[PDB]
Design a protein around this ligand. Structure first.
Ligand code: MG
Ligand code: MG
Ligand code: MG
Ligand code: MG
Ligand code: MG
Ligand code: MG
Ligand code: MG
Ligand code: MG
Ligand code: MG
Ligand code: MG
Ligand code: MG
Ligand code: MG
Ligand code: MG
Ligand code: MG
Ligand code: MG
Ligand code: MG
Ligand code: MG
Ligand code: MG
Ligand code: MG
Ligand code: MG
Ligand code: MG
Ligand code: MG
Ligand code: MG
Ligand code: MG
Ligand code: MG
Ligand code: MG
Ligand code: MG
Ligand code: MG
Ligand code: MG
Ligand code: MG
Ligand code: MG
Ligand code: MG
Ligand code: MG
Ligand code: MG
Ligand code: MG
Ligand code: MG
Ligand code: MG
Ligand code: MG
Ligand code: MG
Ligand code: MG
Ligand code: MG
Ligand code: MG
Ligand code: MG
Ligand code: MG
Ligand code: MG
Ligand code: MG
Ligand code: MG
Ligand code: MG
Ligand code: MG
Ligand code: MG
Ligand code: MG
Ligand code: MG
Ligand code: MG
Ligand code: MG
Ligand code: MG
Ligand code: MG
Ligand code: MG
Ligand code: MG
Ligand code: MG
Ligand code: MG
Ligand code: MG
Ligand code: MG
Ligand code: MG
Ligand code: MG
Ligand code: MG
Ligand code: MG
Ligand code: MG
Ligand code: MG
Ligand code: MG
Ligand code: MG
Ligand code: MG
Ligand code: MG
Ligand code: MG
Ligand code: MG
Ligand code: MG
Ligand code: MG
Ligand code: MG
Ligand code: MG
Ligand code: MG
Ligand code: MG
Ligand code: MG
Ligand code: MG
Ligand code: MG
Ligand code: MG
Ligand code: MG
Ligand code: MG
Ligand code: MG
Ligand code: MG
Ligand code: MG
Ligand code: MG
Ligand code: MG
Ligand code: MG
Ligand code: MG
Ligand code: MG
Ligand code: MG
Ligand code: MG
Ligand code: MG
Ligand code: MG
Ligand code: MG
Ligand code: MG
Ligand code: MG
Ligand code: MG
Ligand code: MG
Ligand code: MG
Ligand code: MG
Ligand code: MG
Ligand code: MG
Ligand code: MG
Ligand code: MG
Ligand code: MG
Ligand code: MG
Ligand code: MG
Ligand code: MG
Ligand code: MG
Ligand code: MG
Ligand code: MG
Ligand code: MG
Ligand code: MG
Ligand code: MG
Ligand code: MG
Ligand code: MG
Ligand code: MG
Ligand code: MG
Ligand code: MG
Ligand code: MG
Ligand code: MG
Ligand code: MG
Ligand code: MG
Ligand code: MG
Ligand code: MG
Ligand code: MG
Ligand code: MG
Ligand code: MG
Ligand code: MG
Ligand code: MG
Ligand code: MG
Ligand code: MG
Ligand code: MG
Ligand code: MG
Lengths: 99, 119, 50, 60, 206, 135, 87
RNA sequence: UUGACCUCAAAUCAGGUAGGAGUACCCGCUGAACUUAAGCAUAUCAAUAAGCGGAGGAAAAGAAACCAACCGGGAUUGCCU
RNA sequence: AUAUUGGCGAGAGACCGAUAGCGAACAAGUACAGUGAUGGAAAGAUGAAAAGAACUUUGAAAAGAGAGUGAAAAAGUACGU
RNA sequence: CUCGUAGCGGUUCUGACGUGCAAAUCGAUCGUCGAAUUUGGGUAUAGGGGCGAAAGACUAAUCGAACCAUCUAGUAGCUG
RNA sequence: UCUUGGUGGUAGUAGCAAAUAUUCAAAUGAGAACUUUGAAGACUGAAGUGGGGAAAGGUUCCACGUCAACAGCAGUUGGACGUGGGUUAGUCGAUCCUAAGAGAUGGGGAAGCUCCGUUUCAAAGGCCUGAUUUUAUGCAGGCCACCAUCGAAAGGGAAUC
RNA sequence: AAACUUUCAACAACGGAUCUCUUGGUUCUCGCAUCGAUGAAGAACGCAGCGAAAUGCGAUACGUAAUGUGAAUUGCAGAAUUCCGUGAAUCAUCGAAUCUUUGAACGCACAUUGCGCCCCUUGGUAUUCCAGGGGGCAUGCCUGUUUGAGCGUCAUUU
């Protein structure tokens, strides 16, 4: 007559994920005009290790199309992607690993 | 022996301030002497004199502000009457005696008569 | 604690100034019933609980 | 050495000493005593003798 | 109705070598661990607490009240009952003692006591104020401090000062013939109060 | 409906009190509407309310409130009764039209529980009335 | 080891002083007063706790303003002063 | 350009108002179980206790979409029945 | 007109009389216990007046023995009985 | 990984003690001792709930449903 | 196995035996196994019975006086009792920052006490002008797309020996 | 025979029953209606010539003013020509004030005596920095004011 261990998991107290050492959410770039109509070039700067994740994470810097600044996107690294490699994102990008 | 408030009401705004400063000097030197004396009951007289001087000064200041705010809407709230919060929420005598013209015509036309059962 | 709050030290000051015996002349007044200090507190006998 | 108000900072102690006794104040150090009152160690400028000022006030 | 029950006492149960009375919990006060809630406990409620809905007044049949009043009036006749009840009336010539209606208009206490002494209530009026005693018991500090005997009942038909004039005289009670309290006529349920009638009172009795 | 709060949908009493889901809330949605508007505008006095519209999730009401401190209300005898302190939060005590409707305050034989308020009626009809000379 | 050795491990505090009632009841992790309910605007008081209501109700403190209201009512909520000087 | 109108905002704008306490009694919501049934589930306890919202010196109710079926009474409330 | 173990002001009693009566007659919601919600005591009485025992002696002292006050010290603050 | 200090436990003596030093200690002997280590402080999870390398363990000497108050003077064909 | 209070016998009894350990003199004192000083003997043996701090305590610190009670013997001594004295900061801490987390607002929920949520579906914002006389500097342009606050006396942090 | 033990009495103890009191409680009746943003209830800290509490008060601090009474208060000390008096008093009454830090608690915050911003003024060679004095700065809602926003929308414009 006691609430069992899998029913206690949804209350989310001691069963939350341990998120201090993670690098951030790995997402694609936002689907904007540049990716919808052409492409955009970013740069792999670091291939780092994400805690709790078996896959390494690429940090890819793109130029902001509308302001003068840099946008750092966090990608899941594909095998063969290296630091300093240009990554192309968009409709007009080519068939290369990492694009 | 102690200042007397009725003799304080006849003084000006500057004489009472100078007497307040003088009394505070007396309190300071008496407080020095209390260290060297086992007892000193004359602390109490100067302390109540300071209280009386400040009371008279505040009476003059508040009556000056009432004469400045005299006979107009929006007196300051410390000079407004403190009765009870419900006693000043309180429809006034005018508002409680407001009567519509229909009810006023009825009240004039048919007031409660005075009568007796004798003849 | 030696690194006190001011509020803690202020209640310490009040407890220190109440830690005194009865003043002797209060036993001499007309119709006195007080014999002693029934709210006397020691550091070794009863904690003042913050 | 003074008992000062619990509301008074070192600026107010220095200003009140400076115009109650007409002295110069090199430094004011302050503690709250264990009986809950404030004590100020007011060091005077070497233009002034604290013994002379204290005998002017009326103690020792 | 909360006396003896301002406690959160529960029984400790058996096994702790104490009787199963409910006991005060907590610690440190002297009261902790002590019995509560029971009639046998110090501090507990009393057995069957008194209520305000006890019967305080008693209904009597009106005709039986009138029966008792009429028999009390008839007992204020012949003097054996008046002597047995108290009432120094051995030197009174005849019972009922009927005085003139001019008594009802006397409005001084001095003239009223002169009239009572003159028609013969002197020894009864002296029996009262020589029977004043401090009351035995705890009643003496429940606003019932002194006890004294009952004096004469002066019964009138109209009041023109006699009530107020005899108000301050100890023992003496006045009464209208329209009422005649049985508590005045047979006090302690002993028949034969000494009664002084006025002529108008005696006539109106019929 | 009103879902009974009761964690995991659980009573813990008799089977007559075990239901959670078809329980109906004795005050109307219009009364809930005026109580929430009275809390939002506590300086005003609720007067009446009326249905304006509804869909499946919500009902929509408009609530008339009167400022008892405005002098256009404090004068003009037809309305300054609302300034009496016995009319603070009429919609919280059931003194609006929907409040008296849900309290059952109506005349006649169909309302024998509720004409003077049924808790007042219950206290009258469950009081033992003893006189000095017992009856 | 649940008794005397474990009592030696009691050197923290669950409750400090309350700014509103001064009771040593401010739970420092909950930021709530156990007895008076602070920082909730309403004061904690329950009808099952009638003795606790008795400890804290109106009359148990100074009544700095309410001790004068009945005198102010008896005189009709006067304004002004009295008139004469002395004997 | 300019001038309204409607709707919506802002301001340490001018004036004002609400909160909290008390809570015996009052108007509501919400709401048990012990208990009784010699078990118990409907029932009962009880439209009660606890919980929550709102008033006043009283509150509420109140001048009939009433009671009736009489030769008819006549707002509401309370007592006797 | 009705209600009212709260508040203010009164008046009463076939009530209780310090283990009773409110928990509390008294510096009582006090002292004290618990982290906390909460729990929660005991404790009235010398004499009409302190007149509360000057003074001598023994003892380091407490104190004793005397003396003395007092109607009473078979009332000496550890005090009516 | 191992022998073994500190530490952290708690095998056996079924030793001492058993109106104790102690409502769980004392002594010897033991397990482990570089990590699923030990620990402070901060923080989160609250009672049919929590938390559990799982013993119905533990949740302030309280646990096969904590503690406090109220309902409640619960009821008892049973005992004094 | 009543309640509260008081009192017995047991009974001058069980006991006051862990942590190696005391002893001689003088002084003080009415009184010294136990106080002070000297002397000797020992122990902790630097993961200390040493020197400091954190939590907690709260004056226990120190001096003077003093022994009715307390220090399960004693006491002239005391963390006891009575009376005072004592805690000094630009540089040490707090204060500030964020952490796991807590939490307002906007808004939605809930009969309601209140719940959710923490940048969300909000019209959420205040900063320099390049340096001065029509300027209490603004009635000038111009920029920032960030979004309460609390949260560490062991983390980060301006500066003293 | 003592001691011892037991019983009884007297005296002395222990203990605090009994009795007798009672500025308390309880119950009934009667009358009245008055808390708070003009800051309440409640809390903390302080305040007296010698006070720990109770009671009272708030840096004007067992109180100030005002009024009535008319000579106290006191346990000591002090002051008491002020005492046929605008005048003692821990007096009564109470209409004027003060009312620390708080608290619904209101610039923000609070396990901090923590950090701001605005106005006036003062000091430091200062519109900007530092300091002191005084006054402000919460939220929701109503009426109004002013400034606005929306091609929501109407007239008017070479
Ligand atoms: Mg569970
Ligand atoms: Mg569970
Ligand atoms: Mg599972
Ligand atoms: Mg997470
Ligand atoms: Mg008011
Ligand atoms: Mg502090
Ligand atoms: Mg200790
Ligand atoms: Mg300092
Ligand atoms: Mg036994
Ligand atoms: Mg008992
Ligand atoms: Mg009792
Ligand atoms: Mg009792
Ligand atoms: Mg009859
Ligand atoms: Mg006469
Ligand atoms: Mg007698
Ligand atoms: Mg008698
Ligand atoms: Mg009697
Ligand atoms: Mg008697
Ligand atoms: Mg008797
Ligand atoms: Mg009586
Ligand atoms: Mg009497
Ligand atoms: Mg009497
Ligand atoms: Mg059922
Ligand atoms: Mg259901
Ligand atoms: Mg009305
Ligand atoms: Mg209506
Ligand atoms: Mg309803
Ligand atoms: Mg019915
Ligand atoms: Mg109803
Ligand atoms: Mg009712
Ligand atoms: Mg009935
Ligand atoms: Mg009757
Ligand atoms: Mg009947
Ligand atoms: Mg243990
Ligand atoms: Mg345990
Ligand atoms: Mg904690
Ligand atoms: Mg507490
Ligand atoms: Mg509490
Ligand atoms: Mg509150
Ligand atoms: Mg309480
Ligand atoms: Mg309390
Ligand atoms: Mg404004
Ligand atoms: Mg309210
Ligand atoms: Mg009620
Ligand atoms: Mg109702
Ligand atoms: Mg029952
Ligand atoms: Mg039944
Ligand atoms: Mg049954
Ligand atoms: Mg049965
Ligand atoms: Mg059956
Ligand atoms: Mg059963
Ligand atoms: Mg029912
Ligand atoms: Mg009922
Ligand atoms: Mg209820
Ligand atoms: Mg509820
Ligand atoms: Mg009211
Ligand atoms: Mg009425
Ligand atoms: Mg009405
Ligand atoms: Mg109505
Ligand atoms: Mg109609
Ligand atoms: Mg009919
Ligand atoms: Mg009718
Ligand atoms: Mg009836
Ligand atoms: Mg009938
Ligand atoms: Mg009586
Ligand atoms: Mg007795
Ligand atoms: Mg008692
Ligand atoms: Mg008692
Ligand atoms: Mg008491
Ligand atoms: Mg505990
Ligand atoms: Mg505690
Ligand atoms: Mg303890
Ligand atoms: Mg006695
Ligand atoms: Mg005598
Ligand atoms: Mg002798
Ligand atoms: Mg003699
Ligand atoms: Mg005698
Ligand atoms: Mg003699
Ligand atoms: Mg003698
Ligand atoms: Mg005697
Ligand atoms: Mg290993
Ligand atoms: Mg090994
Ligand atoms: Mg072992
Ligand atoms: Mg063993
Ligand atoms: Mg080993
Ligand atoms: Mg092993
Ligand atoms: Mg191993
Ligand atoms: Mg190893
Ligand atoms: Mg290894
Ligand atoms: Mg913590
Ligand atoms: Mg938890
Ligand atoms: Mg449950
Ligand atoms: Mg277990
Ligand atoms: Mg429990
Ligand atoms: Mg029962
Ligand atoms: Mg029994
Ligand atoms: Mg027995
Ligand atoms: Mg006992
Ligand atoms: Mg004994
Ligand atoms: Mg012996
Ligand atoms: Mg022996
Ligand atoms: Mg032994
Ligand atoms: Mg040894
Ligand atoms: Mg010697
Ligand atoms: Mg020896
Ligand atoms: Mg030697
Ligand atoms: Mg060695
Ligand atoms: Mg020392
Ligand atoms: Mg000594
Ligand atoms: Mg000893
Ligand atoms: Mg000794
Ligand atoms: Mg010694
Ligand atoms: Mg010492
Ligand atoms: Mg000392
Ligand atoms: Mg000292
Ligand atoms: Mg530093
Ligand atoms: Mg922060
Ligand atoms: Mg929240
Ligand atoms: Mg919503
Ligand atoms: Mg906080
Ligand atoms: Mg911070
Ligand atoms: Mg830090
Ligand atoms: Mg770090
Ligand atoms: Mg640090
Ligand atoms: Mg820093
Ligand atoms: Mg009563
Ligand atoms: Mg205030
Ligand atoms: Mg207040
Ligand atoms: Mg308090
Ligand atoms: Mg004072
Ligand atoms: Mg005092
Ligand atoms: Mg004053
Ligand atoms: Mg006076
Ligand atoms: Mg007075
Ligand atoms: Mg002031
Ligand atoms: Mg005040
Ligand atoms: Mg802050
Ligand atoms: Mg902080
Ligand atoms: Mg508006």
């Amino acid at each position: 007559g006691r609430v069992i261990r899998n029913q206690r998991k949804g209350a989310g107290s001691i069963f939350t994920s341990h998120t201090r050492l993670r690098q951030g959410a790995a997402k694609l770039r936002t689907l904007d005009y540049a990716e919808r109509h052409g492409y955009i070039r970013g740069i792999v700067k670091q291939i780092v290790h994400d805690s709790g994740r078996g896959a390494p994470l690429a940090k890819v810097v793109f130029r902001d199309p509308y302001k003068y600044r840099l946008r750092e996107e966090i990608f899941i690294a594909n095998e063969g992607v290296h630091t300093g490699q240009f990554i192309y994102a968009g409709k007009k990008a080519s068939l290369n690993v990492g694009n | 022996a102690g200042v007397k408030a009725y003799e304080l009401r006849t003084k000006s705004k500057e004489q009472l301030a100078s007497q307040l400063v003088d009394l505070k000097k007396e309190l300071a030197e008496l407080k020095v002497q209390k260290l060297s004396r086992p007892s000193l009951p004359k602390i109490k007289t100067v302390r109540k004199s300071i209280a009386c001087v400040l009371t008279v000064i505040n009476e003059q200041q508040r009556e000056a502000v009432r004469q400045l705010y005299k006979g107009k809407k929006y007196q300051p709230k410390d000079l407004r009457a403190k009765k009870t919060r419900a006693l000043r929420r309180a429809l006034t005598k005018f508002e409680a005696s407001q009567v519509t013209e229909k009810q006023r015509k009825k009240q004039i036309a048919f007031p409660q008569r005075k009568y007796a059962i004798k003849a | 604690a030696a690194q006190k709050s001011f509020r803690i030290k202020q209640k310490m000051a009040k407890a220190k100034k109440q830690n005194r015996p009865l003043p002797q002349w209060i036993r001499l007044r007309t119709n006195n019933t007080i014999r002693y200090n029934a709210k006397r507190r020691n550091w070794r006998r009863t904690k003042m609980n913050i | 050495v003074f008992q000062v108000s619990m509301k008074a900072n070192k600026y107010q102690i220095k200003k009140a000493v400076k115009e109650l006794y007409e002295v110069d104040v090199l430094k004011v150090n302050t503690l709250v005593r264990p009986n809950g009152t404030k004590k100020a160690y007011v060091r005077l400028t070497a233009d002034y003798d604290a013994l002379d000022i204290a005998n002017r006030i009326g103690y020792i | 109705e909360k006396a003896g029950h301002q406690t959160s006492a529960e029984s400790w149960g058996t096994g702790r070598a104490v009787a199963r009375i409910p006991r005060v919990g907590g610690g440190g006060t002297g009261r902790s661990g002590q019995g509560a809630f029971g009639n046998m406990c110090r501090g507990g409620r009393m057995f069957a607490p008194t209520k305000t809905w006890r019967k305080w007044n008693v209904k009597v049949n009106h005709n039986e009240k009138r029966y008792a009043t009429a028999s009390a009036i008839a007992a204020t006749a012949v003097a054996s009952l008046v002597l047995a009840r108290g009432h120094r009336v051995e030197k009174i010539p005849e019972i009922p003692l009927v005085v003139s209606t001019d008594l009802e208009s006397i409005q001084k206490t001095k003239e009223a006591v002169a009239a009572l002494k003159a028609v013969g209530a002197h020894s009864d009026l002296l029996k009262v104020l020589k029977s004043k005693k401090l009351r035995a018991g705890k009643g003496k500090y429940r606003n019932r401090r002194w006890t004294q005997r009952r004096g004469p009942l002066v019964v009138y038909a109209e009041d023109n000062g006699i009530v107020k004039a005899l108000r301050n005289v100890p023992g003496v009670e006045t009464a209208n013939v329209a009422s005649l309290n049985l508590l005045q006529l047979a006090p302690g349920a002993h028949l034969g109060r000494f009664v002084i009638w006025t002529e108008a009172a005696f006539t109106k009795l019929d | 409906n009103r879902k009974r709060p009761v964690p995991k949908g659980a009573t813990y009493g008799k089977p007559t009190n075990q239901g959670v889901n078809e329980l109906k809330y004795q005050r109307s949605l219009r009364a809930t509407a005026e109580e929430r508007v009275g809390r939002r505008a506590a300086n005003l006095r609720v007067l009446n309310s009326y249905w304006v519209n509804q869909d499946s999730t919500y009902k929509y009401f408009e609530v008339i409130l009167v400022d008892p401190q405005h002098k256009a209300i404090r004068r003009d005898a037809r309305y300054n009764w609302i300034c009496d302190p016995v009319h603070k939060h009429r919609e919280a005590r059931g003194l609006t039209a929907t409040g008296k409707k849900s309290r059952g305050i109506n005349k006649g034989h169909k309302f024998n529980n509720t004409k003077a308020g049924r808790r007042k009626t219950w206290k009258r009809q469950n009081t033992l009335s003893l006189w000095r000379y017992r009856k | 080891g649940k008794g005397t050795p474990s009592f030696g491990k009691r050197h923290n505090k669950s409750h400090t002083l309350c700014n509103r009632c001064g009771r040593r009841s401010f739970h420092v992790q909950k930021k709530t007063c156990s007895s008076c309910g602070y920082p909730a605007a309403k004061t904690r008081s329950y009808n099952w706790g009638a003795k606790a209501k008795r400890r804290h109700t109106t009359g148990t403190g100074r009544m700095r303003y309410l001790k004068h209201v009945s005198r102010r009512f008896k005189n009709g909520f006067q304004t002004g002063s009295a008139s004469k000087a002395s004997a």
